[PDB]
Design a protein around this ligand. Structure first.
Ligand code: HEM
Length: 375
């Protein structure tokens, strides 16, 4: 009669109005047919070589693209009319100021959580025409870093480039994955992967999750910075091809949506299990000092024991209790709110290992080109 409105109601969205179409059955109407044609015409190797040259937001598209793709890209690179440059700048500055926390949350928190999102785990696991498993999951764990880049939407930055290339990658995947019998057979009846709804689930595992955890830890998030961070994520969802009718307009909307669309779908899968082990291995192999028990303990603290158990993160009760008691003290100290706290030495070691992890994930994604898959 008049209590919970549908989570996909356009009423709580950036568009604010619209017809009301279930995003489970919406993909990318503009990109999908273009990428299907590019792949079917055998144009992927040439297109990748042309697009390798397109690296900065203010750059003209390389000459020589197929006309349909050129037209798509010229449209896709446009910022929405509701993008606010000042807020975008503020959100980028906030992300940098709080970089150890955001970077740790994206890399460990959202990256490990992704192995409990069955559709994302299955798509990544079964995708064939890009790079190897190890490279793929490392790139999955780095989602958030490009969006949160300090220069993301400036003329010399690259997030428009990254967003447009990602939109094209996803569109290619939608043409490719249904041709994989292992993907089709495990898809639970979804005919085409990476629906709008699926993108928004993943978005909640990033934006909404990171904000929640920063606030819980006592990071100083004033209202204006919270709003600017949301704005970065809203504009980025649009540039990835999410219709404005599905992007939450406010934190209240986003927080309520995450509870309904992300929390209930988290599940262990065989594919996700494989990916968790690969990611845990990748992180432990970095020159960061993140040992398996530190990763486990900090990730369980970050995700909670229910999700940690679902993923299979081994129990570290001594370190988890040390972290729960003292990590908020380290945060308060770094926020300038308390004098230097007497905490166990391993807290400072953990903090340094997280800082080196974040720097390594900043270093690695610098300059890597996003290629369209084929085959
Ligand atoms: C906010 C949401 C998302 C972001 C920011 C995002 C980002 C990206 C990026 C940057 C790439 C390019 C990887 C690279 O080559 O460097 C990519 C590729 C891919 N994405 Fe997403 N994605 C999102 C949602 C999804 C969802 C919901 C799915 C699946 C249900 C998905 C499945 C994939 C697949 C399968 C690839 C190709 C991987 C490969 O073969 O290398 N993505 N995505």
């Amino acid at each position: 009669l008049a209590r919970p409105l549908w989570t996909w109601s356009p009423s709580a969205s950036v568009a604010g109005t619209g017809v009301g179409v279930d995003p489970e059955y919406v993909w990318d109407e503009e990109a999908d047919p273009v990428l299907a044609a590019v792949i079917d015409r055998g144009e992927v190797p040439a297109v990748n070589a042309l697009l390798k040259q397109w690296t900065r937001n203010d750059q003209a598209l390389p000459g020589g693209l197929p006309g349909d793709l050129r037209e798509f890209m010229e449209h896709a690179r446009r910022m929405p009319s509701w993008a606010d440059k000042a807020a975008l700048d503020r959100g980028a500055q906030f992300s940098k100021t709080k970089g150890i926390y955001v970077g740790a949350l994206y890399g460990l928190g959202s990256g490990l959580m992704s192995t409990a999102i069955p559709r994302e785990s299955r798509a990544v696991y079964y995708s064939k025409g890009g790079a190897d498993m190890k490279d793929r999951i490392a790139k999955t764990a780095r989602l958030g870093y490009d969006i949160g880049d300090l220069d993301a939407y400036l003329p010399h930055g690259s997030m428009i480039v990254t967003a447009v290339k990602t939109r094209m990658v996803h569109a290619a995947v939608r043409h490719l994955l249904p041709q994989s019998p292992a993907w089709s057979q495990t898809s639970g009846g979804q005919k085409i992967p990476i629906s709008q709804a699926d993108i928004m689930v993943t978005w909640h595992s990033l934006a909404t999750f990171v904000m929640r955890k920063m606030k819980q830890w006592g990071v100083r998030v004033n209202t204006a910075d919270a709003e600017a961070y949301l704005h970065v994520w809203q504009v980025s969802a649009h540039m990835l091809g999410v219709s404005d009718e599905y992007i939450p307009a406010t934190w209240d909307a986003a927080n309520a949506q995450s509870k309904q669309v992300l929390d209930p779908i988290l599940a262990h899968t065989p594919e996700g299990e494989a990916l968790t082990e690969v990611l845990l291995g990748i992180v432990a192999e970095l020159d960061a000092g993140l040992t398996r028990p530190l990763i486990g303990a900090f990730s369980r603290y970050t995700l909670g024991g229910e999700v940690g158990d679902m993923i299979g993160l081994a129990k570290q009760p001594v370190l988890e209790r040390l972290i729960a008691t003292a990590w908020p003290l380290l945060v308060a100290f770094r926020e300038g709110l308390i004098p230097l706290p007497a905490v166990p030495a391993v807290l400072w070691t953990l903090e340094e290992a997280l800082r080196k992890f974040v720097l390594l994930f900043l270093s690695e994604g610098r300059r890597i080109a996003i290629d369209i898959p084929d085959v």
